[model samples]
Target chain A: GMFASLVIPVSAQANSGEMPQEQQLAVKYMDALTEHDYKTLITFYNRDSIFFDKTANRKYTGGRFIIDFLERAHQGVLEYDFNIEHMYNAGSLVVMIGNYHFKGPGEQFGKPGKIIDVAIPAVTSLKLDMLNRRVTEHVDLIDYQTMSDQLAMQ
Target chain B: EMPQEQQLAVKYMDALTEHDYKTLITFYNRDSIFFDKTANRKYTGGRFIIDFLERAHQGVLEYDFNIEHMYNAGSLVVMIGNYHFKGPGEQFGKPGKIIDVAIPAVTSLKLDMLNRRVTEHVDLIDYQTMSDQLAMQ
Candidate 1:
């Protein structure tokens, strides 16, 4: 019930007019990224998918294991909106850069919950299995130092 | 075939390896701005950008670019690669030691197509791994 709370109020600007073919596929998965539709989100990854946070040097192998982090990473988040400002790809390798607008508690970043609304500049590179319609590998690069300066580790 | 932007980027790197800051300066114009995501710093002007690169190439930090992937959209080009760094640990807070690490990096460059110069540059890198490697106590 609380998990579905994420779906009630968020918009993904898919801007389908000139999106690349792979991004057209990305538009389909965009809705599945919300906190509510995690089940669908997990399905987009291959069984042996590798989710890597290259910035923190943390990696989770396997779809189930990867979803575990994605689920909790938004622990104290209130209104989380993901908007893609740029999408560049080389065939199935798509690089998506966007802002993760997080309005929630600060517990996940530093100390206690303080209801902070901050937009974190985020980037994700997806290595897709176009045939299987699954993500074989996902790598993320974050601006943590700026995040820390803004609040903590957003 | 590599994109023209990629070719231009390789030339910039070649200029770095050659320690030709003079030629490297020609790659950027007055509108140039370089943002280092890892360091949380933004540098403006060709002189400032070339001075920072000089420190890496000619002073303290030493690196070799192993560019892996590159894609472009108009005058904007994004490159995915690794910076094979070998430098004194003091740069990353540790002193009296040497740190050798290959940091994963992504760079996006906005170019002044008409002038054949860079207008904006942004570097997104893996700082946690880089810092931890130098945190060797």
Candidate 2:
């Protein structure tokens, strides 16, 4: 029942920063992502969905766009991951934010890296329009160029 | 009709990524609200959101806005995904960590039909974690 014996006591818990559905969704999404399960990942979205990539100035719509993004990332020798710092849920909305890391082969400015990543803290919000036990409409928000630039320099 | 809304959301995303404060402000209702967990603050109305973004970007390291996923129900929209970043300051950080970074998030946006702009923009980013990162930096 207890994941950690060192878990803070309930009385001592001042905001352990945990949410039910948000954690569930976050875990599911992360698992699907790590496994590169494009099919599973796309199913969580609406059929007529739009993804706004502010940094690349790209939009991923429908299932095709999601698949495309996955394909590109899979083709790469390096990959990105999320180190979840906290999960916050406000009713049907879920938000997770934390450090990001990148790993793989690459040499930049005469530097080589096996796991070269910059620590940029970020937050993503998800609004779930539920019908029974599933999500319908999901929206993402956060500044873009800010994340990319920090990672590149570090 | 779906395509049109998709395009509209994309346009808003584009404006935000490019940091087009003026154009970005136009897409939001005058009374719209912007929630920022990083700053542990919320900006009420389009004017404040626009002004906050302009001033906030100055201290940023790197920002990436990806609409990793979205869903729409009536006038409400929900999105799920993460952002990547590497800041300019040295807190509890490394460049390598930043590159491989992707902090997850989900957001809710409401459309204001009568106002012809976004009426509510509720964000779900972890404020404590972000604040800690900034403090470390």
Candidate 3:
């Protein structure tokens, strides 16, 4: 008798943990980076956060250094997009694997002011401090060969 | 509470680290299909699955997985993990030399609860990053 009145909704299957707040924040962070909203992006990082890029062979400590490094890296970019293929969160850590696209002048890359286009796969690892609502550490991995072939060496 | 499917996934990871193909194959059904995005291929059947692993281990590359996250949604279980490859492998451009490579990946499994086996699986691995690491070595 108890089972007859318990009708499961048709959309119940689709409503399962669709996207947690942590996952949403990760997406927001990517959008902010693409928009070149440094101020808003920097707010997500802790003051003592660590940033490392395996492909670039670079590491930085503190939000100021990280933000400045990103700004320099993103300079002369006309359109930038970070598209996520897969993302997951465990505890305070969020991992994103995706593709990155950029259309910008290649002056900084020694290609004069010619427009440079790059499309490559990238991965981002973020550790968040939920209590403070900031990211404590971030590491990014990208296809250096693809970038070099498309921008600098090409 | 951990779902039975998630437990099976954890066991599969453990089997991978242990290099226990026998145990790993038990998690999949006879008609299972594994879709590997990195290779852009689909391996069908349990026999092909075993053969694939056999060929992979034939080289000097050793494999291990560190599972970071797992989510159980209905009959599907999703896992995000990091895979490590090490040892002397010429395929990695390290001839008679030891090298370490870490790749982040995401895998999803479709479970047949009635049969208690994985019917279909999908994997997305960062092969580009793996290649970059090898180049550095």
Tell me model 1's lDDT, rounded to 2 decimals. Answer: 0.69
Per-residue lDDT of B1-137 in model 3, one digit per residue for the tens? 67677787777768756768788778776689888755667888888887876666555456788776565546666666788877766656677778889887877777787876778777767676677688888
lDDT of 1 by residue, A1-154 (tens): 3554244221343453555667667656665764447778887886699988765668999988888888788665554666655565556766666667766677876657466666656678777788888988877666554465577433
lDDT of 2 by residue, A1-154 (tens): 6575463322233345653544466566555655677777777666565655432335566656666766775664344665654566655656555554556554531235544455434444455554533344333333443355555664
Error of 1 at A17 (Å): 4.6
- Candidate closest to the true structure, highest DockQ: 2
**DockQ, 0 to 1 scale, candidate 3:** 0.03
Sorted by TM-score, highest first, which candidate order results? Answer: 1, 3, 2
User: How many pairs in model 3 have backbone atoms within 3 A of each other, for residues 3 or more apart or on separate chains, i.e. clashes?
Assistant: 0
From the highest lDDT down, the ranking of the candidates is 3, 1, 2
Error of 2 at A147 (Å): 6.0
List TM-scores of chain B, every candidate: 0.86, 0.71, 0.87
Interface Cα RMSD per model, in Å? 14.5, 9.9, 15.8
Candidate 3 collision pairs = none
Of candidates 2 and 1, the better by lDDT: 1
lDDT of 3 at A5: 46
The deviation in Å at residue A111 for candidate 1 is 4.1
- Displacement of residue A7 (Cα, Å) in model 1 is 18
